[PDB]
Design an enzyme around this catalytic site. Sequence first.
Site, mmCIF file in Angstrom:
data_model
loop_
_atom_site.group_PDB
_atom_site.id
_atom_site.type_symbol
_atom_site.label_atom_id
_atom_site.label_comp_id
_atom_site.label_asym_id
_atom_site.label_seq_id
_atom_site.Cartn_x
_atom_site.Cartn_y
_atom_site.Cartn_z
ATOM 1 N N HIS A 183 0.797 -1.212 0.000
ATOM 2 C CA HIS A 183 0.000 0.000 0.000
ATOM 3 C C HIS A 183 0.808 1.229 0.000
ATOM 4 C CE1 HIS A 183 0.130 -0.026 4.504
ATOM 5 N NE2 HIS A 183 0.165 1.281 4.307
ATOM 6 N N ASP B 78 -0.572 -7.523 1.883
ATOM 7 C CA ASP B 78 0.016 -6.191 1.902
ATOM 8 C C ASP B 78 1.525 -6.402 1.981
ATOM 9 O OD1 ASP B 78 0.286 -3.589 1.780
ATOM 10 O OD2 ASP B 78 -0.301 -3.089 3.878
ATOM 11 N N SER C 162 4.032 2.560 8.349
ATOM 12 C CA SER C 162 3.604 1.449 7.478
ATOM 13 C C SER C 162 4.734 1.005 6.586
ATOM 14 C CB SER C 162 2.421 1.818 6.570
ATOM 15 O OG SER C 162 1.499 2.563 7.327
ATOM 16 N N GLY C 163 4.717 -0.260 6.160
ATOM 17 C CA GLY C 163 5.841 -0.936 5.460
ATOM 18 C C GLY C 163 7.044 -1.326 6.359
#
Lengths: 48, 233, 5, 52
Positions: B42, B88, B185-186
């Site tokens: 994402h 994801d 995120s990630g």
Amino acid sequence: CSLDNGDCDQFCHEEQNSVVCSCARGYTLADNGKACIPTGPYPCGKQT
Amino acid sequence: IVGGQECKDGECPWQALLINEENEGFCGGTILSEFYILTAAHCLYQAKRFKVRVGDRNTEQEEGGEAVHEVEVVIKHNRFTKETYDFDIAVLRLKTPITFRMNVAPACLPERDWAESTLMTQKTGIVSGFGRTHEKGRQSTRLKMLEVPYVDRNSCKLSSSFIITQNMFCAGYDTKQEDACQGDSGGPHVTRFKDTYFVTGIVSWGEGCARKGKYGIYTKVTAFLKWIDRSMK
Amino acid sequence: XIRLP
Amino acid sequence: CGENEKYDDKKCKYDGVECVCEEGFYRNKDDKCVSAEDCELDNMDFIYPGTR
Ligand code: NA
């Protein structure tokens, strides 16, 4: 293996009643067949 | 990261920071080797252009060891959906290889079955990042890390309004108001086994940040170990 | 990140 | 026949999901026979510079 990671340092699998230790890339299995010895200066998973 | 603490020198060396065209960080990643960064699919949508920085602790001050790397290829999981955030996962190949240093070093990838029975079942993992320090606040100027309990999957589902697939897992606290947040995120979730750190999670999503009764959701790396290997060839 | 119902 | 195929059976098991193939392999989204790892090739978009 469900007991003390079968005294493996990293990975533990079972062959026919034999616990069988193993290691991430950049590590080599010790002679003791349990410990994992880094082959290089920046082995994965170690803080520096 | 809401709560938790700044990483000391050499404490979180597998953290990468993905930076946009304004050279601002929008997302994190985990260094898997000299060429490969693990991240969330994402995050690919949250920038027009990006590079990968390694070694940053304070992003307002160069300190030595820091480098920027151009991304050569993006391997995105093509089953990713923004509707459920299932799958994801993505892996970035850098143009130029990382030079490991203090504060720059890979996290270990675990063996699948072993990680299922023995990493996923430890009490805590560690999430790290430069993201917001409050749901409505600003990005951190410093890398932070937070120790987070693994959360049983029925508890995870119970608490969550959105689906929790087999490719995800929850970690965090129920009353304590500390968790990952936007900009994390990630980034990495790693689990210590006998003082070696293996990557067990990718920072994915949460219903707010550190809300009472809610947990951070992570892509479950042990679900994607074959796909990760193949991506690194 | 933030996903709110 | 084809690559990794033998004359005479096993589809690709993908990560995070749920003329015959040789002793070795599995059928991808195109029964080309290819390794367990090579299956996962069906589940990748490759992308350059990049991105949104
Ligand atoms: Na919380």
